[PDB]
Structure formats: structure tokens, C-alpha cells
Amino acid sequence: RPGMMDSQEFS
Amino acid sequence: RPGMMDSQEFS
Amino acid sequence: NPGTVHPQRSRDQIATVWIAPWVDSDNAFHQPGRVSFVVSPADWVLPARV
Amino acid sequence: TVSTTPPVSAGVRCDNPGTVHPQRSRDQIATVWIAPWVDSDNAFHQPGRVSFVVSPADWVLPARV
Amino acid sequence: NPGTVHPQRSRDQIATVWIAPWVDSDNAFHQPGRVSFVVSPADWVLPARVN
Amino acid sequence: QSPATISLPQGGQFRLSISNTDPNMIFIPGDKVTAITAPGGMLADKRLTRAGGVLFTSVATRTFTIFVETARGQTFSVVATPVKGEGRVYRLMSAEPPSRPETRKWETAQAYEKLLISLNRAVLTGDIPDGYGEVKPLSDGIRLPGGFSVTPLKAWAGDQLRADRYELRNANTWGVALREQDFWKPGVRAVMFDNNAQTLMGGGRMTVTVIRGNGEG
Amino acid sequence: QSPATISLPQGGQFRLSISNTDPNMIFIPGDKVTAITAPGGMLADKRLTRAGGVLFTSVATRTFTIFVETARGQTFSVVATPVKGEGRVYRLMSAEPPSRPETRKWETAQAYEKLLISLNRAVLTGDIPDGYGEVKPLSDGIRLPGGFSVTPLKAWAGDQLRADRYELRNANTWGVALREQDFWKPGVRAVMFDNNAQTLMGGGRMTVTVIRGNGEG
Amino acid sequence: QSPATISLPQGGQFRLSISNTDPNMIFIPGDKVTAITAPGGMLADKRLTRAGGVLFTSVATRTFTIFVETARGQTFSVVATPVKGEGRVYRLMSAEPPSRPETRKWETAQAYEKLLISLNRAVLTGDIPDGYGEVKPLSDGIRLPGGFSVTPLKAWAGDQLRADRYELRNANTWGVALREQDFWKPGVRAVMFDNNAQTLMGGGRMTVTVIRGNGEG
């Protein structure tokens, strides 16, 4: 998975 | 995928 | 012929009213100036023929 | 009807009572001194002088010289 | 004696806008004029000293 | 850097370069493109965009003709020569405008200002509005500058405003200049010189309408 | 560091620099980005934020064209050069005010002088109306009379009205008394001075809020 | 020892060191972070904290860009260079404050004190409250210092308080200084000098309002 991102969406 | 573009329509 | 002469239209009448300085509910002070309005619309006229 | 606050000021280059930069007037402050008193929880109060505004301010067109 | 002070009661701030000539909905010309408003109102200024 | 604005006539042909590697965009101000036609197998992908827009990507290496049809029955032709480089945006515009929209004044004036205006107009016309009825003219309603003499003429009054007309008479025999502000009396709302004449001479008899406040407070 | 503002029109194309390893963001001051299109296989991942911006990551190495599209009806193309470095933030300022039919209803519902007052109080305090959005200031929007110079600061536009703030500097050694009227240019509609000033001493720093018709003239 | 307060603009980039072995914390006073984005596989763990806080732990050994988005549409960027050492806390702050909250005076005054104040104000205005009605002024209601002469003027009374106004007259022809405490008579609740003037001269005629107790007990 290159160029991929990681995003947590806090409630 | 020739000539295919990435068109992401966001909601 | 009094008729069959190229007709022109007449001139509108313009009247100016000056508003006294006043204040409003939101406490703004208004100084408008003079407002001009047309009292009479125009009317057709056959020119005098010499 | 809307209020009309300014009487015409004392009567490039046009002498108009209107169209002058308007200023606002001054509020009126009044002081009341409260007599020393006591309250239900038995506390003795010495307030001092309390100042309140009797009249709000109003618009004014300066006199023009 | 408790420390006596004099009330200040700073004034208001006024901003005036000038309105450029415009013609209204019902067709009456409005020649240049002005409207004035109070940006920040007046208020009591807390004292800096109590002596 | 800025779209290439191109005003071609209806059925017009405009030869323009397009990019064979990057998407290109054609948009018409005030119109929404409905359809796009090209030789089969030239334009690989075509996508509608917010408002009226076509983003097309062509892998072809030969010049070809492309037709665009908008939503108001406009059809324009374009001759496209693909070239290596940046995608190009084109602002398609009509040649001679078909119609002229008359934009109404959106501006609305203050209610009090309208009330003063209507009454003045009605008095001038002589029609007196339903609420208003005739009464006695006020004896002194205006300031008299420079020897002017005022004779009460007519008046009408109503629930919130009242009107008086006075005839000015000039005894000065001098050239005077009128400024409506001179005729101000503590309590006046508006002054109208029926004849819009700046200067009155001797015997300048302009009639002025002043609306004060009935029920003044 | 601060975001880079570029101000392209709806036809604008700007050559910027995009990053590779870490993500990048382009956001509209006043609009919500809804779609973003790039050549296939060029953008690795994209995400839409709650504020209305777009986070994208480009893993490719060739220069490419990206189109961004907003909800009010807008489209801006940017040309990105993939370089190794940290992420970059771009502020895509409009430059041609967008169409906002919802704002026009509030603009026209109320009176006019009131509307002028409101829009000006807001500019003074900073509480910008909900419908208004930040647009590029007009480089030359007011008459500069006899020795002043101007620089632009901020601009807010709705549908039928605009709003600009211009920093005035007095080059002339002698102090110049200024009247709002001097500044009138065809198409302006109100000129108001923040610090009410009869005169401006040399080396003056005075800002003046001027509003104009949107698209008029 | 103290959080590193950093006021960067919207879309701002701030390069800061973070620890690769221990958790780090970023918090915004008055705002609650909603989301945090970083290059994939850089920040291993991210946790929400009481109020607005992000505790992140990164095992990476390379500089990377991280975006934080709060709950009021604020987005800030941070360039983080991991380094062996203690975890670092960062207080993110806005540059120019968007709005100014006018905090109302929370303070409330005693009921009796308000009652005295309202009446004094009403008498001064001349409006007389519903309960109050006019009666006879009390013959001697105040102490007369230094030759002052008091003439009853007006009074009104009500269920629990009564008011009297007297006109002071100065026969001294000396410069006197007023202190409201001098005019105290066993049974007075308050004394108001209508004109707030410290010194009265000869013929200093200040009018003073004194509220005593009707139904005195």
C-alpha cells in the first residue's frame, strides 16, 4: 500500500 | 486503463 | 395635415424632496439628501407645423 | 414616527445644517449614597456611593462656523 | 476610610458611512448622503488606583 | 494562467491545441454543456463537471473534430490537434448576445422615507389620500429668509403626518438662492420646492410643501 | 510558515509544487471542495475534510494537471510538479466571486441602507455575515486623489454587493484633508472611514471600507 | 517544564521535534481536535484525551508532515522530526482571534440596594412608579449644615419607601464642600445630590433627594 494515508476520525 | 482519470466525487 | 406628422413624446416632470435628518430603531442617524421622483409620466405630442 | 434628534445647527463649500460629521452626546451620571444597613444573615453593609446612568446618549450635529 | 474613586464612563465610538447615488425600487433618485452607527458602545472604566 | 476566452459564432469552428496526456476542460459561462461528440475511439474519457463543464482526455495522435451542444440549443465545433504538454482550458462564448435581461433595481428604501415621498407626491398631484382630510394651514410653519412673505394656502392632515403648502413671495428684488435647509423649523420632516428652480428673483413665488408631524411628540 | 495563496480565476491554471512521501492540502476560503480529478494512476489517495478542503497524496514523478471543483459552482486547475519534501498547503482564493443564490435572498429581503450599515459594522468588528465569502481584493477599486497610494488587505463578496479594505498612505508632505466623495469611482456604493478623520497627516495609515456592485461594470 | 505555546496561522506549518520512544501530546486551548492525518505507517497509535488532545506515538526515524483538524474548522500542519528523548507537549494556538466574546457582568446586587436605586432614578426622571402617589413633603427631613436653608419641594410615597426632594439654599457666601453624610437624620435611607457637584458656593442651590421609610418602625 504505497502512497497511502492513515486517518482516525475521533468522535 | 487507457486515458482513464481519477474522478472522485465527494459527498 | 395636423395629423400624419412624426410624433415626439413629451418630458417627464421631476420633483425633489429633502428629508430631515432622522434616527431609526437600531439607532442609526440618517442624512439622506434630496430624493427626486417623477410625478407625471410622458405623453404624445404632434409638433406644430410651419 | 421615527425620532428627529437634531435641531438645525446654529444659523467643496456648501453650507448645509445637514451633512456634518455627527457626534454623540454625553450620558448623565447620578450618585446615590446608601445608608448603612443590616441584612437577614446579620451582616452589616457599608456600600458607599452607587452611580447610575439616568439618560442614554443622543445624536448631535455640531454648530458650524 | 475605604479608598474612594471617581467614575470614568468612557464615551462611545461613532463610524459614519457615505452612501453613493442610487435609484430605488420605486424609481426615486437618492443623491449622496450619510448614515452613522455606534461601533463600540460606552461603558464604565474599572479604576486603576483606589488611593 | 487564464482561460483562453474564445467567442465563436453558432456552428463555428475553432482550431485549438489539446494535450494528449492530461485532461482538458471546456466551459461556457452561463451555459451547461449537455453532450459531446467526437470520432469514435479518439476521446477516451468524458466527464461532467460542476455547472457546465467537460473534462476530456484523448490519447489520439491525430487532429480531429469535436462537437459540443449546450442546454440552450447552441452547438459549437472545435478542431483539436493533440500535443504533449499541459492540459488546456477554453472558455467558449457566444458571438452576438441573443437577448438582453433588464435587471430590476433590487434596492429598497426605508419605510419612513417612502412615507414622506408618497405624501409629497400626492399633495403635488392634488389627489389626497384616503386617510388625509383638509384642515387649517398652520400660521407659521417655516423660516422666512431674506424678506420673504408667506401666505397660507392649503393643508391636509392624517394620523401620523400633516402637510402644509405656503406660497413664498419675494420682496427683496435681489437675486436669491434657495437651499431647502434654510426653511427649517424645529419639528419639520421635509421641504419641497414645487418648481425645481435654484434661484428666485424679485417676486419669485415658489410654493413649498412642508410635512411636519401631526400628533407631534 | 503560512499557507500560499494564489488567487486563480475560474479559468486559472497555476504551476505549483506538490509533495511525494507526505500528504498535501488545497482549500477554498469560502467554499467546500466536492470533487477533484487527476490523470488515472497519478493521485495515490484523496480525502475530503470537514472544513471543506481536500487532502491528497501524489506518488508519481511526472508533472500532472489536477482539477478541483467546489459546491457553489467553481473549478480551478493546478499543475503539480512532484518533488521530494514536506507537505504543502495552498489557499486557492477565488478571484471571481461565486454565485450564491441563497445569499441573495438574505441580501434582498431587507432594506438597503440597513444592509450597507450591517455589512460595514461587520467589516469593522470582524463578524462576517454567514453567506459572505473571502474573495481576491480588487487591485484598483477606488479613485486615488493627488498623492495617496493604496495596498489591498481583505475582500468579502456575496451576490450583489462586495466589500474591500484599502490601506491608504499619504506620500505628500503636507497633510491632506479627505472627504469620502473623493474616492468614488463608477461602481462603488459606500465609502466609510474607520477612524473618523477630518484630515490625514503625512505618513498616514488609514484603512477605508469601500463596497461595490458584484460584477457591475 | 511548561508546554511550548505555538501560535501559528491557519494552514500554518511548524517544524517541531517529537520523541520516537515516548508518547507526545498536542492540545489546543478552547478547541477539541477532531482528526489527525500522517503518512501511512508513521504514527503507530493515536488516542483522544479528555477535552481536545492527541497522544501519538511514532516509531519512525524520518521527518514527516502531520495535519490536525479541530472542531471549529481549523487545520494546522506540523513537521515532526523524531528524536530519542522525552515526550513533548505542544500548545497549538490561533494567530489572529476570529471573534470577541463580550462577557456580561455576572454580578448581581442586593435587593434592597436595587430598590433604593430604582426609586431615586425614577424620581430624578420624574416618572413616578405605579405604587407611588403624591403627598405632602416632610417639614424637616434632613440636617442643615452651615446656614443652609431648605424649602420643601416635592414628595411621593408608597408602601415601603417614601421620597422627598428639598431645595438647598446657601446663605453662607463661603465655599462649602458637600458630603452626603452630613445630611443624615436618624431614619434616612439615602441622599442624592441631583447635580453631582462637590462644592457649593454662595447661593449653591443643589436639590437633594432623600428616601426614608414610609411605615417607619
In this structure, what are the phi and psi dihedrals at residue H77, rounded to the nearest 5 degrees? -110, 150
Decide: E38 and C28 in contact? Cβ < 8 Å. Answer: no
Chains that touch C (3 or more CB pairs under 8 A): D, E, F, G
Please tell me which residue of chain H has the smallest CA distance to G30: H73
**Coil/strand/helix, residue D34:** strand
Decide: G125 and H97 in contact? Cβ < 8 Å. Answer: no
Residues in chain C within 8 Å Cβ distance of D4? 20-23
- Specify the experimental method: cryo-EM
Task: Give F107 to chain D, closest Cα distance, Å.
Answer: 21
Q: What is the β-pairing status of strands F133-134 and F162-169?
A: unpaired
E near F: at least 3 beta-carbon pairs less than 8 Å apart: yes
Q: H142-163 as b/e, with b when 16 or more CB fall inside 10 Å?
A: beeeeebebeeebbbbbeebbb
Measured between alpha carbons, how far is F193 from C10 in angstroms, rounded to an integer?
Answer: 22
- Cβ pair G117:C26 closer than 8 A: yes
Decide: G8 and G91 in contact? Cβ < 8 Å. Answer: no
- Cβ pair H194:D30 closer than 8 A: yes
Q: F112-126 as b/e, with b when 16 or more CB fall inside 10 Å?
A: bbbbbbebbbbbbee
Q: Is D64 at the interface with chain C, CB within 8 A?
A: no
Instruction: Tell which residue, G91, G133, G93, G82, has the closest CA to residue G1.
Output: G91
Judging by beta carbons within 10 Å of its beta carbon (0-12, 13-18, 19+), is residue H207 exposed, middle or buried? middle
Measured between alpha carbons, how far is C35 from G89 in angstroms, rounded to an integer?
Answer: 52
| H213 beta partners | none
Instruction: Tell which residue, F117, G178, C27, has the closest CA to residue E30.
Output: F117
Measured between alpha carbons, how far is H196 from D50 in angstroms, rounded to an integer?
Answer: 12
In eight-state DSSP terms, residue G106 is H
Measured between alpha carbons, how far is F63 from F75 in angstroms, rounded to an integer?
Answer: 20
DSSP string, chain F: ---EEEEPPTT-EEEEEEESSS-EEEE-TT--EEEEE-STTTEEEEEE-SSSEEEEEE---S-EEEEEEETTS-EEEEEEEEESS---EEEEE-SS-S----PPP-----HHHHHHHHHHHHHHHT---SS-EE-PPPS--S---TT-EEEEEEEEE-SS-EEEEEEEE--S-S-EE--GGGG--TTEEEEEESS--SEE-TT---EEEEEE-TT--
- Cβ pair B3:F58 closer than 8 A: yes
Instruction: Tell which residue, H210, H202, H216, has the closest CA to residue H142.
Output: H210
Point out the residue among G39, G113, G114 whose CB comes nearest to the CB of F23: G39
Task: Give C28 to chain G, closest Cα distance, Å.
Answer: 9
- Give the contacts of E3 (CB within 8 A, at least 6 positions apart): E50, E51
Decide: G196 and E16 in contact? Cβ < 8 Å. Answer: yes
Residues in chain C within 8 Å Cβ distance of F110? 24, 30
**Coil/strand/helix, residue G92:** coil
Measured between alpha carbons, how far is H50 from H32 in angstroms, rounded to an integer?
Answer: 9
CB atoms within 10 A of CB F5: 11
- Give the contacts of G216 (CB within 8 A, at least 6 positions apart): G187
Residue with the three cell numbers 431587507: G110
Please tell me which residue of chain A has the smallest CA distance to H46: A8
C-alpha radius of gyration, chain F, whole number: 35
Measured between alpha carbons, how far is C41 from F121 in angstroms, rounded to an integer?
Answer: 13
- The residue among A4, A5, A8 with the most chain G CBs within 10 A of its CB, best to mutate, is A5
Instruction: Tell which residue, F45, F24, F42, F44, has the closest CA to residue F87.
Output: F24
Instruction: Tell which residue, H67, H16, H9, has the closest CA to residue H37.
Output: H67
User: What resolution (Å)?
Assistant: 3.3
- Cβ pair B5:F55 closer than 8 A: yes
Decide: G131 and G106 in contact? Cβ < 8 Å. Answer: yes
- Give the contacts of F112 (CB within 8 A, at least 6 positions apart): C22, C24, D1, D2
Residues in chain D within 8 Å Cβ distance of H143? none
**Neighbouring C-alpha atoms within 13 Å toward the C-beta of G44:** 21
Please tell me which residue of chain E has the smallest CA distance to G114: E35
Measured between alpha carbons, how far is G18 from G15 in angstroms, rounded to an integer?
Answer: 10
- The residue among H16, H32, H65 with the most chain G CBs within 10 A of its CB, best to mutate, is H65
Decide: G167 and G194 in contact? Cβ < 8 Å. Answer: no
Residue G60 in grid coordinates: 508519481
Measured between alpha carbons, how far is F166 from F140 in angstroms, rounded to an integer?
Answer: 10
Residue with the three cell numbers 452589616: D44
Residues in chain E within 8 Å Cβ distance of C26? 37
> Strand F75-83's sheet: what is its strand order?
F13-19, F75-83, F64-70, F33-37
In this structure, what are the phi and psi dihedrals at residue H155, rounded to the nearest 5 degrees? -160, 155
- Cβ pair G113:C26 closer than 8 A: no
Task: Give B3 to chain G, closest Cα distance, Å.
Answer: 7
Cα-based angle F205, F207, F213 (whole degrees, multiple of 5): 150
Break sites following residues in chain C (C–N > 2.5 A): none
Measured between alpha carbons, how far is H192 from C6 in angstroms, rounded to an integer?
Answer: 85
What type of residue is F139? Answer: S
Phi/psi zone of residue H41: left (φ > 0), alpha (ψ -120 to 50 degrees), beta? left
Q: H27-46 as b/e, with b when 16 or more CB fall inside 10 Å?
A: bbeebebbbbbbbbebbeeb
In eight-state DSSP terms, residue G115 is H
Residue H203 in grid coordinates: 447661593
Measured between alpha carbons, how far is F144 from G3 in angstroms, rounded to an integer?
Answer: 67
How many helices and strands (H and E) does chain A possess? 0, 1
Measured between alpha carbons, how far is G119 from G123 in angstroms, rounded to an integer?
Answer: 6
Residue with the three cell numbers 508518547: H23
Task: Give G16 to chain B, closest Cα distance, Å.
Answer: 20
Decide: C42 and C12 in contact? Cβ < 8 Å. Answer: yes
Instruction: Tell which residue, E43, H121, H194, E44, has the closest CA to residue D54.
Output: H121
Q: Is G147 at the interface with chain F, CB within 8 A?
A: no
Please tell me which residue of chain F has the smallest CA distance to G7: F1
Q: How far is CA F127 from the centre of its chain?
A: 30
Measured between alpha carbons, how far is G55 from G26 in angstroms, rounded to an integer?
Answer: 7
C-alpha radius of gyration, chain A, whole number: 9
DSSP string, chain H: ---EEEEPPTT-EEEEEEESSS-EEEE-TT--EEEEEEETTTEEEEEE-SSSEEEEEE---S-EEEEEEETTS-EEEEEEEEESS---EEEEE-SS-S----PPP-----HHHHHHHHHHHHHHHT---SS-EE-PPPS--S---TT-EEEEEEEEE-SS-EEEEEEEE--S-S-EE--GGGG--TTEEEEEESS--SEE-TT---EEEEEE-TT--
- Give the contacts of H68 (CB within 8 A, at least 6 positions apart): H26, H33, H35, H36, H54, H75, H76, H77, H78, H92
- Give the contacts of G58 (CB within 8 A, at least 6 positions apart): A3, G18, G19, G20, G24, G38, G42, G43, G44, G64, G80, G82
DSSP string, G122-180: HHHHT---SS-EE-PPPSS-S---SSEEEEEEEEEE-SS---EEEEEEE-SSS-EE--G
| G149 beta partners | G169
Residue F89 in grid coordinates: 482550458
Residue with the three cell numbers 482528526: H35
Decide: F83 and F60 in contact? Cβ < 8 Å. Answer: no
Residue F125 in grid coordinates: 398631484
Residues in chain F within 8 Å Cβ distance of E26? 109, 114
Q: Is G113 at the interface with chain C, CB within 8 A?
A: yes
In this structure, what are the phi and psi dihedrals at residue C2, rounded to the nearest 5 degrees? -60, -35
**Coil/strand/helix, residue G114:** helix
Decide: H1 and H64 in contact? Cβ < 8 Å. Answer: no
Point out the residue among H35, H40, H42 whose CB comes nearest to the CB of A8: H35
Task: Give F101 to chain D, closest Cα distance, Å.
Answer: 37
Decide: H142 and H167 in contact? Cβ < 8 Å. Answer: no
State whether the Cα torsion D53-D54-D57-D63 is positive or negative: negative
In eight-state DSSP terms, residue G206 is E
Q: Is G11 at the interface with chain F, CB within 8 A?
A: yes
Chains that touch D (3 or more CB pairs under 8 A): C, E, F, H
Instruction: Tell which residue, F33, B8, F25, F22, has the closest CA to residue G37.
Output: B8
Expressed in angstroms, the distance from the first to the final Cα of chain B is 25
